[PDB]
Amino acid sequence: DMYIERAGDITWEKDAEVTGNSPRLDVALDESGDFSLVE
Amino acid sequence: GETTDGVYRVMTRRLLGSTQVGVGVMQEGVFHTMWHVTKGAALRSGEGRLDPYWGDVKQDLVSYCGPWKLDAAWDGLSEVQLLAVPPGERAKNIQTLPGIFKTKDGDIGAVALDYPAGTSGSPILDKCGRVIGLYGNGVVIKNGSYVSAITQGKRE
Numbered sequence: 001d002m003y004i005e006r007a008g009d010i011t012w013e014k015d016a017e018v019t020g021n022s023p024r025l026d027v028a029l030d031e032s033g034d035f036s037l038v039e
Numbered sequence: 040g041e042t043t044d045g046v047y048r049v050m051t052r053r054l055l056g057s058t059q060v061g062v063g064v065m066q067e068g069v070f071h072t073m074w075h076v077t078k079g080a081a082l083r084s085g086e087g088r089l090d091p092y093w094g095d096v097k098q099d100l101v102s103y104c105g106p107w108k109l110d111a112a113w114d115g116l117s118e119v120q121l122l123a124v125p126p127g128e129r130a131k132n133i134q135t136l137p138g139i140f141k142t143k144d145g146d147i148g149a150v151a152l153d154y155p156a157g158t159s160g161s162p163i164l165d166k167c168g169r170v171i172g173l174y175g176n177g178v179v180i181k182n183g184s185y186v187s188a189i190t191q192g193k194r195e
């Protein structure tokens with residue numbers, strides 16, 4: 001049986017760690033809401 | 040229960056100790072998370088009970104106490120912030136320029152950041168602080184690394 005606890009406000013934080021790339025991906029979405037790579 | 044706007048952890052005791060299964064957003068009295076986190080189960084906010092109101096397994100979204108409220112969209116150009124809330128660890132912004140999921144039905148923002156599954160439901164923000172979608176439904180690429188979609192609902 002699941003419960004929720006607060007973890008913060010929702011705010012943009014200037015000089016946060018900038019990271020990760022920007023890939024363009026061909027994907028399909030099935031009826032179970034799972035994405036897959038088209039190839 | 041606590042209805043203050045903000046980001047929350049989704050906890051269960053049904054397993055060993057207390058386990059973080061996901062994350063969500065409280066806005067305008069409605070709690071927003073991903074369907075695979077709760078499976079549409081009711082939630083507790085202290086002594087308050089939260090009852091599912093809307094949900095769609097294909098969108099992998101669900102809302103509690105009212106209709107989906109978050110209607111902000113990636114502009115297609117700007118960097119975003121993932122407000123990650125990992126299990127056992129403090130909330131932490133991570134700035135990134137999102138990639139693209141190309142599908143037969145149109146193009147979706149994507150973020151290339153790998154976090155634990157229990158981070159699912161963490162929101163993604165624009166520069167004005169508005170939630171443009173939730174993290175936790177995506178794909179594993181040639182490498183072995185994870186890429187989440189930017190998943191956004193419709194506000195009626």
Ligand SMILES: Cc1cc(CO)c2cccc(NC(=O)[C@H]3C[C@H](N)C3)c2n1
Pocket residue numbers: 033034075099153154155156157158159174175176177178179185
């Ligand atoms: C294999 C894997 C890995 C990570 C991190 O490494 C994940 C991180 C967050 C969410 C996941 N799950 C999903 O994308 C959806 C697919 C279902 N609807 C749940 C993750 N799956």
